[PDB]
């Protein structure tokens, strides 16, 4: 209509990327929501630094429409003739053509552009939107924004690139029953009617568009004060006020820890946290207004698990890290996203480590990031940390294991190598140098290279400009050689083409008899190096500190198995987990015989630590998974591993006792017991479940999930399913809801799972934020593995229409096919993919799950007999 679409390419707006010569300085943004109508309007005025002759000005806009022909101002202050406005859909631009070109802003004078826009609050979790909740029987509303990475442009027209930093003064006209929040504190409130209020916020510091946030709400607040004297407050529904307490404690403690560690003041006068009742990601670091999904913020000590406690603490820590890395210093372009996410993923563990001293957090990095992503990054369809992105779908896709976990892992290695004290100072100098501007990876190296004089750029580039990682092959006890580690032995190790040729500069640490030594393994040492007396055993890569795997000689591996059987405590908890993790990965990759790997599990009846058990359970889950339908192998593996956990499972018992890590251990260990078919563990679950159904007995917090899952699995029926469904509706605590959803996915009943799948289309029952979680839970169920898979196929058009191909969670949902392991199942996947070839943000996940399923097929072919032999001979 006004500002209509045109297929005109002849101009610089055909470029995916914005021009270098147009730069915003300041945004004047006003929005007015019609909450009950699911609509809003706004005007935005943008001051523009023009650097080159141009007849056109363009910026990002999606879905939201322009309603008034835009208005441009010369730097002197005069009004500029405008011929046309038009939308260019292909690159999400709205363009305006001036009558006849104009002139760079040479002085302190700037162009001013004003646009009138109207958008929707319904049918979406990005941009500016409204959702509801219930309070004392009344349906209440809350409106908020979510922009990362390319959704600012849905909320309001803007220069929607992270490096187009500008300053912000936002105002909102809302009904008076409501408050309004944004990045900055309130400046002034003025009555429009006796019904409407206009809330104006004070001028922001320069910040990227994706960080710009506002909300209209009727939430209560829980308050805290930083050591700086700034108010740190969490907004929360009155009924849920008590559950905001913990997040308040951790925000205070971690805010205070960080401001000191980074040697830099938090840039805003206040900081707010709020959980939107329906929220599309886990949390979002909007400067001064961090938004949450309830499960990641709201915690009840009387009802929530230790798992939940640690999650809340970590996400809060995480989002707080961004207030420095991401907010103050932002990446120049999304290819450098890890500068944000890896740093947050790394420092989160230090944040919470300060707050909660006996959580062994620094160790837990191995379980949360390091070892999981070493699985991910051993695929051909991984990608380097520095990622080429050319579409919004490509950009959103890279919020993934690589940016977060490998980012986190290579910082962990870097810190240990360069040493913490110097890593600290180097991050500090990087922070003061690039404050309120944008950095590239190159800059962070140079920053740390000024801090250690060590070769940081030379060494870290190898870890960063190519995908994958090495396995160190041990020859003798002491000679090591490096080689790319790929899970698929048939894959071509030189692909895709890398300038660095898939060799790394590896910082290598090893323990000789309780004494530790260091070496940097140069890329150019083509025929390996020797590790610098009188030695019988050499412990390489202690605590799995380096982002690599170590393949000892078979003789050594054998000797490690025996040493574990005799006195496992000889190795640290981490070293055990790491040795077990490498061996099973090496076996998977056909680099070590499975008999050798399995032999390392023999000691387990005496295993008592969290870390080794976690990585054991991870490795076994996969093997068990591949033989699910093998009536010959399965009972044997079940029987074995049942026997290996039984003592620890019995020792810990079905009761909440012990410190944090013990409580976590009991969870995974009792769950594995149940998974492995321990009659007595299953009976504990059923018994507790039956009691829970009696309506009063509040289950031990760290056992609930297991009780709902295995209780429903073993004794669930329509009566208890219906009851569980009601309970899920009735409870206010999102953390409990999510457990109950997992419970409901556990029923061994096709009819009930079918009803459950149908509920996904009902927004009164399942929130939009939870659809993918539920699909994923159902896929874990022995019937539902195929039910969820079939349902996403039948309902693909429906999902795409509801979420759009740009939604990452929709892109990722095909990973429910990870357990598939037959040529039949692979053919199904490929057929579905060929029928719906427009994959959007699902393009990478598709590649990844396909590789995995192919690997599974090969794996079964290579290893069935060997694994069978090992189990048969033992039992
Ligand atoms: C929850 O799980 C518990 C196991 O972790 C169950 O408790 C166990 O029940 C077993 C059978 O009743 C007992 O087995 C006995 O073990 C001893 C060895 O210590 C043997 O001498 C006995 O032969 C053997 N049973 C018999 C009938 O002779 C376990 O000792 C017992 N206790 C422990 C601490 O493991 C719970 O029963 C289970 N709860 C529910 C409700 O099912
Ligand atoms: C590393 O794994 C090796 C390979 O599995 C182990 O060696 C195996 O030890 C088994 C004893 O548990 C033997 O199983 C026996 O096999 C014969 C058939 O050849 C049967 O008659 C026996 O009944 C059976 N034993 C039992 C208890 O049922 C295997 O002979 C033997 N395999 C090989 C290839 O030598 C190693 O022990 C192990 N190393 C460790 C633990 O350090
Ligand atoms: C929010 O609701 C509006 C109004 O119901 C949706 O717009 C409608 O879209 C359908 C087709 O998709 C048309 O049949 C209606 O005539 C439209 N009505 C109006 C007033 O535009 C809108 O699509 C919804 N927004 C989202 C994101 O789903
Ligand atoms: C938040 O911090 C407070 C203390 O700063 C925690 O401690 C509570 O308060 C008193 C005295 O300060 C303690 O003796 C109690 O053990 C605590 N609980 C209660 C119910 O009073 C409080 O636990 C922290 N909040 C959490 C963990 O959610
Ligand atoms: C459990 O819950 C369901 C859903 O509320 C009950 O309702 C029946 O559900 C089917 C569709 O799944 C409808 O076609 C029937 O009309 C429903 N019955 C009604 C409305 O009375 C189901 O009956 C419940 N079962 C038990 C044992 O409580
Ligand atoms: C799965 O759940 C359905 C739903 O309850 C079960 O079907 C019911 O069976 C009972 C007893 O045979 C009847 O009283 C109900 O009328 C049935 N309900 C419906 C909706 O058909 C079914 O038996 C269960 N199946 C399994 C394998 O457990
Ligand atoms: C503890 C974190 C890993 C939780 C995580 N949140 C984040 O990473 C935020 O900092 C992200 N900036 C939010 C985000 C996630 C995905 C796509 C776009 C934007 C999330 O899961 O949302
Ligand atoms: C930085 O923090 C220090 C100590 O907390 C404070 O004295 C100073 O005013 C801050 N600098 C500012 C606000 O520019
Ligand atoms: Zn983050």
Curated annotation (Swiss-Prot):
Cofactor binding, per record: Binds 1 zinc ion per subunit.
Q: What is its EC number?
A: 3.4.11.7
Cellular localization per UniProt = Cell membrane
Residues the record marks as site: Transition state stabilizer = 404
User: Which ranges of this chain reside in the Extracellular compartment per its record?
Assistant: 1-875
| Broad EC category | hydrolase
Regulation of activity is described as: Substrate specificity is modulated by calcium which enhances the enzymatic activity for cleavage of acidic residues while reducing its activity with basic residues. Inhibited by aminopeptidase inhibitors amastatin and bestatin.
Query: Where does it sit, as one GO cellular component term?
Result: apical part of cell
Q: Name one GO biological process term.
A: proteolysis
CDD domains in alphabetical order: M1_APN-Q_like (cd09601)
Q: How does it sit in the membrane?
A: Single-pass type II membrane protein
> Single GO molecular-function term?
metalloaminopeptidase activity
Keyword Cell inner membrane attributed: no
The protein's matches in Pfam families, at most eight in alphabetical order, are given as:
ERAP1_C (PF11838), Peptidase_M1 (PF01433), Peptidase_M1_N (PF17900)
- Tissue-wise, where is it found? Expressed in choriocarcinoma cancer cell lines (at protein level). Expressed by epithelial cells of the proximal tubule cells and the glomerulus of the nephron. Also found in a variety of other tissues.
State the function annotated in the UniProt record: Regulates central hypertension through its calcium-modulated preference to cleave N-terminal acidic residues from peptides such as angiotensin II.
Q: Which family does it belong to?
A: Belongs to the peptidase M1 family.
* Summary of subunit composition and partner proteins: Homodimer; disulfide-linked.
What is this protein called in UniProt? Answer: Glutamyl aminopeptidase
Tell me which species this is from: Homo sapiens (Human)
């Amino acid at each position: 209509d006004i500002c209509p679409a045109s297929e005109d390419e002849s101009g610089q707006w055909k470029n995916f990327r914005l021009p270098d010569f147009v730069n915003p300085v300041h945004y004047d943004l006003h929005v007015k929501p019609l909450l009950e109508e699911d609509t809003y309007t706004g005007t935005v005025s943008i001051s523009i630094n023009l650097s080159a002759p141009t007849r056109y000005l363009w910026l990002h806009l999606r879905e939201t429409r322009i309603t008034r022909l835009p208005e441009l101002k010369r730097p002197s202050g005069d009004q500029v003739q405008v011929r046309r406005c038009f939308e260019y859909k292909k690159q999400e631009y709205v363009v305006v053509e001036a009558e006849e070109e104009l002139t760079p802003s040479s002085g302190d004078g700037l162009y001013l552009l004003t646009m009138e826009f109207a958008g929707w609050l319904n049918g979406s979790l990005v941009g500016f939107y409204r959702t509801t909740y219930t309070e004392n029987g009344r349906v209440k509303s809350i409106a908020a924004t979510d922009h990362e990475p390319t959704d600012a442009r849905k909320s309001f027209p803007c220069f929607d690139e992270p490096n187009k930093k500008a300053t912000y003064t936002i105002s909102i006209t809302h009904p008076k029953e409501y408050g309004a929040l944004s990045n900055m504190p309130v400046a002034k409130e003025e009555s429009v009617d006796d019904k409407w209020t206009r809330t104006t916020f004070e001028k922001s510091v320069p910040m990227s568009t994706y960080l710009v946030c506002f909300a209209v709400h009727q939430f209560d607040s829980v308050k805290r004060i930083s050591n700086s004297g700034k108010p740190l407050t969490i907004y929360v529904q009155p009924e849920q006020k008590h559950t905001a307490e913990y997040a308040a404690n951790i925000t205070k403690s971690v805010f205070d820890y960080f401001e000191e560690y980074f040697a830099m003041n938090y840039s805003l006068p206040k900081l707010d946290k709020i959980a939107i009742p329906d929220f599309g990601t886990g949390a979002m670091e909007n400067w001064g207004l961090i938004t949450y999904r309830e499960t990641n913020l709201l915690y009840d000590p009387k009802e929530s698990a230790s798992s939940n406690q640690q999650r809340v603490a970590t996400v809060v820590a995480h989002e707080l890290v961004h207030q420095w890395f991401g907010n103050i210093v932002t990446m120049d372009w999304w290819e450098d996203l890890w500068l944000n996410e890896g740093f947050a993923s790394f420092f989160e563990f230090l944040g919470v480590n300060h707050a909660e001293t006996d959580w062994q957090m620094r160790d837990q990095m191995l379980l949360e990031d390091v070892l999981p992503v070493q699985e991910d990054d051993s695929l051909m369809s991984s990608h380097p940390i520095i990622v080429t992105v050319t579409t919004p779908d490509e950009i959103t896709s890279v919020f993934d294991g690589i940016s977060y976990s490998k980012g986190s892992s290579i910082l962990r290695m870097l810190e240990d190598w360069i040493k913490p004290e110097n890593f600290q100072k180097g991050c500090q100098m990087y922070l003061e140098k690039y404050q309120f501007k944008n950095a590239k990876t190159s800059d962070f190296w140079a920053a740390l290279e000024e801090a250690s004089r060590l070769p940081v750029k030379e060494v870290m580039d190898t870890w960063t400009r190519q995908m994958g990682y090495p396995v160190l092959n041990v020859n003798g006890v002491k000679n090591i050689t490096q080689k790319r580690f790929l899970l698929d032995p048939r894959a071509n190790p030189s692909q895709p083409p890398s300038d660095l040729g898939y060799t790394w500069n590896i910082p290598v640490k090893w323990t000789e008899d309780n004494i530790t030594s260091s070496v940097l393994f140069n890329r150019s040492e083509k025929e390996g190096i020797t590790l610098n007396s009188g030695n019988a055993f050499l412990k390489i890569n202690p605590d799995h500190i380096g982002f690599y795997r170590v393949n000892y000689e078979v003789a050594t591996w054998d000797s490690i198995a025996t040493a574990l059987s005799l006195n496992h405590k000889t190795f640290s908890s981490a070293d055990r987990a790491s040795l077990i993790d490498d061996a099973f990965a090496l076996a998977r990759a056909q680099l070590l015989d499975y008999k050798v790997a399995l032999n390392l599990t023999k000691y387990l009846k005496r295993e008592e630590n969290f870390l080794p058990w976690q990585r054991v359970i991870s490795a076994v889950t996969y093997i068990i998974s591949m033989f699910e339908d093998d009536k010959e192998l399965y009972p044997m593996i079940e029987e074995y591993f049942q026997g290996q956990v039984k003592p620890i499972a019995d020792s810990l018992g079905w009761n909440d006792a012990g410190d944090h890590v013990t409580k976590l251990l009991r969870s995974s260990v009792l769950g594995f017991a149940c998974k492995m078919g321990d009659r007595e563990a299953l009976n504990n679950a059923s018994s507790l479940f039956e009691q829970w159904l009696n309506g009063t007995v509040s289950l031990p917090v760290n056992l609930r999930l297991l009780v709902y899952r295995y209780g429903m699995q073993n004794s669930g029926n329509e009566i208890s399913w219906n009851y569980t469904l009601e309970q899920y509706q009735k409870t206010s605590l999102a953390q409990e809801k999510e457990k109950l959803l997992y419970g409901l996915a556990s029923v061994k009943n096709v009819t009930l799972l079918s009803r459950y799948l149908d509920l996904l289309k009902d927004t009164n029952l399942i929130k939009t934020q939870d659809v993918f979680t539920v699909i994923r839970y159902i896929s874990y169920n022995s019937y539902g593995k195929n039910m969820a898979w079939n349902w996403i196929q039948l309902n693909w058009d429906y999902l795409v229409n509801r979420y759009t191909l740009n939604n990452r969670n929709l892109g990722r949902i095909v990973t429910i096919a990870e357990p598939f392991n037959t040529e039949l199942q692979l053919w199904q996947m490929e057929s579905f993919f060929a029928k719906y070839p427009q994959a959007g943000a699902g393009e990478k996940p598709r590649e990844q799950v396909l590789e995995t399923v192919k690997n599974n097929i090969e794996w079964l072919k290579q290893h069935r007999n060997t694994i069978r032999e090992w189990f048969f001979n033992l039992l």
